[PDB]
Design an enzyme around this catalytic site. Sequence first.
Site, PDB file in Angstrom:
ATOM      1  N   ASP A   1       0.816  -1.211   0.000  1.00  0.00           N
ATOM      2  CA  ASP A   1       0.000   0.000   0.000  1.00  0.00           C
ATOM      3  C   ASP A   1       0.850   1.262   0.000  1.00  0.00           C
ATOM      4  O   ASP A   1       0.444   2.273  -0.581  1.00  0.00           O
ATOM      5  CB  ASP A   1      -0.951  -0.001   1.200  1.00  0.00           C
ATOM      6  CG  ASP A   1      -2.198  -0.829   0.956  1.00  0.00           C
ATOM      7  OD1 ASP A   1      -2.591  -0.980  -0.219  1.00  0.00           O
ATOM      8  OD2 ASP A   1      -2.789  -1.323   1.939  1.00  0.00           O
TER       9      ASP A   1
ATOM     10  N   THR B   1      -9.424   2.422   7.222  1.00  0.00           N
ATOM     11  CA  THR B   1      -8.792   1.158   7.580  1.00  0.00           C
ATOM     12  C   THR B   1      -7.347   1.328   8.031  1.00  0.00           C
ATOM     13  O   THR B   1      -6.734   0.347   8.468  1.00  0.00           O
ATOM     14  CB  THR B   1      -8.843   0.184   6.398  1.00  0.00           C
ATOM     15  OG1 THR B   1      -8.162   0.755   5.272  1.00  0.00           O
ATOM     16  CG2 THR B   1     -10.284  -0.115   6.012  1.00  0.00           C
TER      17      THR B   1
ATOM     18  N   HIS C   1       2.051   9.723   3.814  1.00  0.00           N
ATOM     19  CA  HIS C   1       3.402   9.461   4.299  1.00  0.00           C
ATOM     20  C   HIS C   1       4.174  10.749   4.548  1.00  0.00           C
ATOM     21  O   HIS C   1       5.056  10.783   5.414  1.00  0.00           O
ATOM     22  CB  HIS C   1       4.138   8.590   3.277  1.00  0.00           C
ATOM     23  CG  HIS C   1       5.442   8.022   3.751  1.00  0.00           C
ATOM     24  ND1 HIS C   1       6.500   7.794   2.896  1.00  0.00           N
ATOM     25  CD2 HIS C   1       5.848   7.600   4.972  1.00  0.00           C
ATOM     26  CE1 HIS C   1       7.507   7.273   3.572  1.00  0.00           C
ATOM     27  NE2 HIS C   1       7.137   7.144   4.834  1.00  0.00           N
TER      28      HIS C   1
HETATM   29  C1  LIG Z   1       0.534   1.942  11.798  1.00  0.00           C
HETATM   30  C2  LIG Z   1      -0.731   2.658  11.319  1.00  0.00           C
HETATM   31  O1  LIG Z   1      -1.659   2.882  12.094  1.00  0.00           O
HETATM   32  S1  LIG Z   1      -0.847   3.183   9.654  1.00  0.00           S
HETATM   33  C3  LIG Z   1      -0.660   1.583   8.784  1.00  0.00           C
HETATM   34  C4  LIG Z   1      -0.657   1.750   7.263  1.00  0.00           C
HETATM   35  C5  LIG Z   1      -0.483   0.414   6.535  1.00  0.00           C
HETATM   36  C6  LIG Z   1      -0.458   0.647   5.020  1.00  0.00           C
HETATM   37  N1  LIG Z   1      -1.705   1.237   4.496  1.00  0.00           N
HETATM   38  C7  LIG Z   1      -1.718   2.219   3.597  1.00  0.00           C
HETATM   39  N2  LIG Z   1      -2.988   2.541   3.349  1.00  0.00           N
HETATM   40  C8  LIG Z   1      -3.767   1.773   4.107  1.00  0.00           C
HETATM   41  C9  LIG Z   1      -5.142   1.677   4.261  1.00  0.00           C
HETATM   42  N3  LIG Z   1      -5.955   2.462   3.559  1.00  0.00           N
HETATM   43  N4  LIG Z   1      -5.637   0.780   5.125  1.00  0.00           N
HETATM   44  C10 LIG Z   1      -4.830  -0.003   5.826  1.00  0.00           C
HETATM   45  N5  LIG Z   1      -3.513   0.063   5.700  1.00  0.00           N
HETATM   46  C11 LIG Z   1      -2.952   0.948   4.862  1.00  0.00           C
END
Ligand SMILES: CC(=O)SCCCCn1cnc2c(N)ncnc21
EC number: 2.7.1.23
Lengths: 261, 261, 261, 261
Positions: free
Chosen positions: D45, D158, D220
């Site tokens: 992702d 998510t 990011h």
């Molecule tokens: C440590 C945290 O709370 S952020 C984790 C990000 C994991 C990668 N990723 C990037 N976009 C998503 C997304 N929409 N849904 C879940 N995971 C995602």
Amino acid sequence: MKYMITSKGDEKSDLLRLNMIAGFGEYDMEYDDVEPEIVISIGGDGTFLSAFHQYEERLDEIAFIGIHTGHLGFYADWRPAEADKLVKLLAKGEYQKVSYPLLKTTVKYGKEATYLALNESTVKSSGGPFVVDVVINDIHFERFRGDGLCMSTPSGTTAYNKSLGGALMHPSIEAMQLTEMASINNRVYRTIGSPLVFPKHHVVSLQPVNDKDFQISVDHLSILHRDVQEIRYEVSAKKIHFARFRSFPFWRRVHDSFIED
Amino acid sequence: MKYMITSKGDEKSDLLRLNMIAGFGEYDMEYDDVEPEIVISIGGDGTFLSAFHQYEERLDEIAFIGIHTGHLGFYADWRPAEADKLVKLLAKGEYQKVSYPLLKTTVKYGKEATYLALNESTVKSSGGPFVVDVVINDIHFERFRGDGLCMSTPSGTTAYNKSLGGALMHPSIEAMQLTEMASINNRVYRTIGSPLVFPKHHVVSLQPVNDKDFQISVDHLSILHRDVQEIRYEVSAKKIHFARFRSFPFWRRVHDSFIED
Amino acid sequence: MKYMITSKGDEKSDLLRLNMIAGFGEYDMEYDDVEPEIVISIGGDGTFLSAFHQYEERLDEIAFIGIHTGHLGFYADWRPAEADKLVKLLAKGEYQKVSYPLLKTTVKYGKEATYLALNESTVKSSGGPFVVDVVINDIHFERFRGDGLCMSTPSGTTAYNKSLGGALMHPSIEAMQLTEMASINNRVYRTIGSPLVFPKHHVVSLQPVNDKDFQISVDHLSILHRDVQEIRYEVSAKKIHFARFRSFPFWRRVHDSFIED
Amino acid sequence: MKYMITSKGDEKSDLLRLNMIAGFGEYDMEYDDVEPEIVISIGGDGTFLSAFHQYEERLDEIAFIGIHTGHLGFYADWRPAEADKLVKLLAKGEYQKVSYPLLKTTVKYGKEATYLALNESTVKSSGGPFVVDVVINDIHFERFRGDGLCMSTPSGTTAYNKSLGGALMHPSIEAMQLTEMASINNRVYRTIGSPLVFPKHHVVSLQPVNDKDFQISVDHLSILHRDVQEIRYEVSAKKIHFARFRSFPFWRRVHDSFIED
Ligand SMILES: CC(=O)SCCCCn1cnc2c(N)ncnc21
Ligand SMILES: CC(=O)SCCCCn1cnc2c(N)ncnc21
Ligand SMILES: CC(=O)SCCCCn1cnc2c(N)ncnc21
Ligand SMILES: CC(=O)SCCCCn1cnc2c(N)ncnc21
């Protein structure tokens, strides 16, 4: 010495029970379910829970052991494969004992009913709204409006307490924990929201404000109490005693149950 | 005896400080901020917190008192109107003392840094992802991925611990509480989620998995630690001692702060 | 046009009702509680809620208004001091209308019962354990074990949904929100934990796994349903219509209720 | 048509990229990373996230596809085994497209900086206390004190939103969700606590009260912004467009990620 064994009822636990009895016959062990000094539970945590409440009047004279014929339990924390080795060490004795705190629940009417909880005691309304005044050591702390309240033992924190956001506390801490169920909070009705951990000798008292009918649970037991004036919670002076055979730390038991195993 | 008084810095606390010193001069009291036996804080909880860490090497020889010139504090729990009555009873002494547990934080590198926390100690990453292995009594409990972790003293549970969902526990319970900050949980990464209360002598150890740079806070102090191999948390053997003048229960102090006053 | 007014029952609301009727008589307004085009509620949110369900078969022909004789309500959001000004503008009409989405609940047995919820619909067990399989758009999503589940309308999110951790969503969003009650989660039983917001035309279906008796609530109504095969949740095609007289934003109504007023 | 492929950088994704390019050469497909109409992400992702922000100025002319060479991703939701079948259908086209809403972040100083977020945008303090006034549609809603705030897209729920207690909402709902980070609540400081879902055209504005330096993240990207007067959040008018090849429902993607797979 005198012993007895309760079984969940399925053939897995019944056959495991008959084998331990046959193995116990090879030793100086008498089967007695009236005045047992060793109470063995075979099944899960609910089987151990029924075994606890079956003999909750001889707690100072009993060392409990739990065997899980299914998934791991916090009370039935010994696999069936260790049943034979469990029989030998129980027979010649010399085992160490560990004690967990218990919760005392006093229900006052217009007599008085007292209960002993190994896991938790919950209070809900009889269908209508649940409003109650929470009094801590004779100090009015809050007026609770919501689904209900749960007072948990240390070992009971891994059960219903955990589902309510409460903290998991090591059972060597003689304390009790109070958690809320779906409390309503606005500018006019205020609850603390956070769980509350109470040390020994602290008395938490629930007092009605309108309806005097509440559905009170004590571990698995649940009764509709009518015309109640007070519910008193405090850490009990009595402790449940386990037979200790090897190192199975509580935190490892928490890891195996919720993280992985 | 020997005493000293710290002030928040505003004119409300400075003038209240000069009056207590003038009142102390009417008694057998010497002002000494090098070896004081009485440390009075005037301001809020942060003023008491700075006063605690200023003398955290003579804790067994000091009885602390906090005065709040603003809103009520859990450490500065005496209103300015009681300053004159506080001077008299401190002067002739005979006061009772109460002691709260403290948190010891050990940071190991490739020397060793130890800290004493009255409220809590937090660990966050240096900007990148925060992944750490949580080891409880030499048992690997979980791999934590998220924003960070917070280990709280009993009296510190009303502070940052409460904002993280942790439970409020009475300060007479010698224990510490660990809470999570925005942990990520899926089928592949598992954390307990619930807060964890640890008794005395239990050692919770954080160990890096990738980055060895973490932003560690101890009460108000916060430092970026580099090349760290371990963070050790445990209930400290040292206790902070308060001077007790009348009954201000902790639960009443919780009620006044969060429910109403 | 045709109108009617319901009252909470206390003398504050009854007298306020008699005055509005007397003021309505000064205009081209006929009192009719069989086929009213204007339904006025006087009391609180429960009074408006009973008024909604009393006429939930003529929703497309009614513009509701709520007056709160007590604290502010999300449906009864007009103070008693505006009753006279409310009578005049309702009389000559020309008022704008706003519509909120509703929740449709379908209960299937071995006939079929359908309900319309303005706030939420909850499902709990009949005393035993509550285990249910959650199916989203014919896709098995999770097996839920716990106290129960709550599907909330947008305007209903400020009610029981909020007490369960659900999000508050603006009522212009045609959607529904599902929240959990004390779900049990370990390595073996997995629930999502987070609230779930579903758009229009998405069908969430609860299906039994063991017991087929569940206590189902729809706003204030609550019935024990026996021998149920499925509970279907979806955003209803029907909308409740309000009469709009001035700008009272939903977020301001949220601020006044929970922040301050 | 014109296409390009980004890779995570490991040899698993680089080799999978070279094969798709070789397969694309068998069709009427030109490689162009300046003006591509198809953007393929290979990795996870975060790789798709970097690919989104690399071309966030030609969103209306691009259909994105994500391939996960590791665990399943919500954006990279196609296994490497479907790479060859993905090449054929992309080549002859005729694919359907799905669009997800985006979040617009406007940062005002004493010029103006605007950002587009696919997942979320967070605001934290620069080390000191984080206090901010939350203004919803020019209405002062609350004064937030805590760690920070997070405004999430529907598909972003998510991610970090879920770790903060926010609800998961289907991406077809054009909305945004605001969640709190470790807010401090007492009788004097009041926050809503619940997550807030905002529809399109609703403007949520953060305004400083003391410090005007905040650490703002956009997916990011994370920058320390100084001398800021306002942070404006609203649902963007622009949408990210995906190429749709078969039915992979969002709720099934949620089930596979958090329940089991
Ligand atoms: C440590 C945290 O709370 S952020 C984790 C990000 C994991 C990668 N990723 C990037 N976009 C998503 C997304 N929409 N849904 C879940 N995971 C995602
Ligand atoms: C659906 C619920 O929230 S209660 C689940 C009870 C499972 C059996 N059990 C009985 N005692 C315990 C215990 N102490 N810790 C965990 N589980 C326990
Ligand atoms: C924004 C946060 O979550 S930390 C707030 C700290 C307020 C001052 N204070 C200092 N000590 C305490 C304490 N023990 N209990 C409550 N408040 C305290
Ligand atoms: C104890 C609970 O959790 S339900 C409280 C219900 C109060 C009356 N009411 C009825 N409708 C609403 C509404 N939409 N928003 C807030 N309150 C409402």
